[PDB]
Every structure is written in structure tokens, then in C-alpha cells.
Amino acid sequence: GVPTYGAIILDETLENVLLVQGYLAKSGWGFPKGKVNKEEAPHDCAAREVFEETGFDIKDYICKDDYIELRINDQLARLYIIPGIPKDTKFNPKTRREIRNIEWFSIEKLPCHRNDMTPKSKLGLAPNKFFMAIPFIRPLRDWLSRRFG
Numbered sequence: 324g325v326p327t328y329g330a331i332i333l334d335e336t337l338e339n340v341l342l343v344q345g346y347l348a349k350s351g352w353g354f355p356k357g358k359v360n361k362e363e364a365p366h367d368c369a370a371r372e373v374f375e376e377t378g379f380d381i382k383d384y385i386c387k388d389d390y391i392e393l394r395i396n397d398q399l400a401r402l403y404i405i406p407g408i409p410k411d412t413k414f415n416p417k418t419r420r421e422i423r424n425i426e427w428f429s430i431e432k433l434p435c436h437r438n439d440m441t442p443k444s445k446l447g448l449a450p451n452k453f454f455m456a457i458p459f460i461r462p463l464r465d466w467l468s469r470r471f472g
């Protein structure tokens with residue numbers, strides 16, 4: 324799989340994160356990110372995808388060492404961590420054929436796993452609208468604990 328790059332944008336209080344909602348196969352909420360172009364550097368791809376999906380330019384704010392990276396079914400996803408972005412910032416996606424909505428969410432209220440169906444004696448997991456975000460939540464909380472306490 325081709326690697327994806329994007330960002331975790333936090334507000335000034337460090338309580339809230341910015342998620343985007345896609346369409347169809349991507350119909351739920353996730354961090355902004357997308358596939359790298361041939362010859363494109365990781366930091367440039369992250370700024371390009373976040374700008375297409377949110378209208379906000381991160382280029383002057385990226386720190387090269389500050390990111391969370393996960394491998395999900397053999398595709399690598401790297402999200403640069405971007406704190407301190409005010410909640411009154413005006414976000415407007417570029418690619419509105421791909422992005423339904425853009426909203427701030429409370430980090431303490433977001434799930435860090437889906438729920439099972441053991442009350443129904445049935446295997447698998449119940450649907451969750453945060454499915455794309457969920458794998459990053461626990462690693463984010465651990466990262467913020469260490470850097471900020």
C-alpha cells in the first residue's frame with residue numbers, strides 16, 4: 324500500500340481535536356490524511372492533504388520529530404501533531420466531493436476501541452462512526468501525557 328500522511332490538530336486547551344467526515348466507504352469521522360505522490364516528501368504530502376481537506380495550511384507549524392505512525396493492514400499512516408490551533412479558526416475544505424463536514428471533538432469523549440456484541444452472543448464489533456480515528460486515540464493520549472503531563 325502507498326503511505327498516507329496527514330495531521331492531528333489540537334486547540335489551545337489541548338482538550339479538542341479536529342476531525343473530517345468523508346463519503347461512501349469513508350462515510351465516518353477521521354483525522355485528515357491522504358496518499359503520497361511519487362517523489363513527494365512526507366512533510367509536503369501532510370501539508371497538501373490537510374490543506375485540501377480543511378483549508379488550513381500546516382506547513383509553518385510541522386515539527387519533523389512530532390508524529391504518531393501506525394501500520395494498518397500493511398499501509399503506513401503518519402499523522403504530524405499540531406497543537407495550539409484556535410477553535411475560532413475558519414476551516415473550509417477544498418475537495419467538497421470528498422469531505423462532508425469538519426468539526427472539533429473532545430478527546431476524553433472519543434472512543435479508543437469499538438464495543439463487542441457479547442450481550443447478543445454474536446462475534447465481531449458494533450458499527451462506530453469514529454472507526455478511522457479510533458486506532459490513534461490511545462497513542463495520542465500517551466503522547467500528550469509524556470510531552471505535557
Ligand SMILES: O=C(c1ccc2c(c1)OCO2)N1CCCCCC1
Pocket residue numbers: 327343344345346349352353354355356357358421455
Ligand atoms: O482517512 C482518509 C483516507 C485517505 C486516503 C486513503 C484512506 C483513507 O484509505 C486508503 O487511502 N481520509 C480521506 C477522506 C475521507 C475522510 C478522512 C480522511
